[PDB]
């Protein structure tokens, strides 16, 4: 009845598509913005650096 | 010497003459040329000092 020896299961998303649940991703997104924020932290002020 | 006397045309004699007074040595420079040495230097170094983050993308 079957076409061959075995039949591997289908991944729902495409192979290599990154996905994650829970509170870890939104913390990573916030930490990503804070990482960009730290570059512009000492630039603020009339006594900042280029 | 320059603190004592007010005459301000005495400098470094490089050719080895016996007198350092430049009235006799025939040397003259422009004011716009000597001014730009200080202006372009002091205005650049403000930019050099402000740099904090230095990112260099390797070719």
From Swiss-Prot, chain A:
Subcellular localization, as worded in the UniProt entry: Cytoplasm
Signal peptide: none
Biological function: Molecular chaperone; assists the folding of proteins upon ATP hydrolysis. Known to play a role, in vitro, in the folding of actin and tubulin. In yeast may play a role in mitotic spindle formation.
Subunit structure: Heterooligomeric complex of about 850 to 900 kDa that forms two stacked rings, 12 to 16 nm in diameter.
Family under the similarity heading: Belongs to the TCP-1 chaperonin family.
Protein name: T-complex protein 1 subunit eta
Gene responsible for this protein: CCT7
UniProtKB/Swiss-Prot annotation, chain B:
Top-level taxon of origin: Eukaryota
TM spans (from-to): none
Localization annotation: Cytoplasm
Biological function: Molecular chaperone; assists the folding of proteins upon ATP hydrolysis. Known to play a role, in vitro, in the folding of actin and tubulin. In yeast may play a role in mitotic spindle formation.
Family of this protein: Belongs to the TCP-1 chaperonin family.
Subunit structure: Heterooligomeric complex of about 850 to 900 kDa that forms two stacked rings, 12 to 16 nm in diameter.
Name this protein carries in UniProt: T-complex protein 1 subunit epsilon
Taxonomic source organism: Saccharomyces cerevisiae (strain ATCC 204508 / S288c)
Span within the parent record: 501 to 559 of 562
